[PDB]
Amino acid sequence: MQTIKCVVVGDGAVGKTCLLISYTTNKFPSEYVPAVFDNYAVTVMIGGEPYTLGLFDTAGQEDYDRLRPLSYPQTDVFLVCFSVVSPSSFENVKEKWVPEITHHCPKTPFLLVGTQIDLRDDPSTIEKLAKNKQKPITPETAEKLARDLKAVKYVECSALTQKGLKNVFDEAILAALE
């Protein structure tokens, strides 16, 4: 209980980096991304009881056989991030993440977060989809996928505005107790 380990991972997600950096100091635009990606540790004050928080993010490598599972994951909280503006990203959650989770041995609470709301497929974007007749998927269609097995809870956040972190900020504390 001295420290809380949490891992962050999403399916591709082009704005995956901007999501992590925006939390460190705000930077959705990420006009310029850093070369090598390093990990950052931050602590939050709560009722006067500061707790350290370790954030882990994949930075390519892979070919180094990092082996996240380490035959014994030390993560007590698993976070997932996906976009609801693209269709292929919707199936990717079930085609790869649903089965891949088996390697992690579903024995811990999972949280499903929806990001990129508000944009809901900006107009210029829905036009590009209209040509392929894809159309964006609604959050209700995604919520059913989480309740397909045993999703603990689902939440939506807007990174474009500070309305996204405020939603996942209160929920993040709940995991701290666990």
mmCIF file of N, CA and C in Angstrom, residues 5 52 76 152:
data_model
loop_
_atom_site.group_PDB
_atom_site.id
_atom_site.type_symbol
_atom_site.label_atom_id
_atom_site.label_comp_id
_atom_site.label_asym_id
_atom_site.label_seq_id
_atom_site.Cartn_x
_atom_site.Cartn_y
_atom_site.Cartn_z
ATOM 1 N N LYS A 5 0.724 0.861 -8.232
ATOM 2 C CA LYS A 5 1.226 0.624 -9.617
ATOM 3 C C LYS A 5 0.061 0.644 -10.609
ATOM 4 N N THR A 52 2.366 8.149 -3.993
ATOM 5 C CA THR A 52 3.147 8.209 -5.260
ATOM 6 C C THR A 52 2.418 7.416 -6.346
ATOM 7 N N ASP A 76 -1.748 -3.545 -10.246
ATOM 8 C CA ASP A 76 -2.996 -3.871 -9.502
ATOM 9 C C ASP A 76 -4.177 -3.179 -10.185
ATOM 10 N N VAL A 152 -15.922 -3.565 -15.050
ATOM 11 C CA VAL A 152 -16.296 -2.944 -13.747
ATOM 12 C C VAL A 152 -17.100 -1.667 -13.989
#
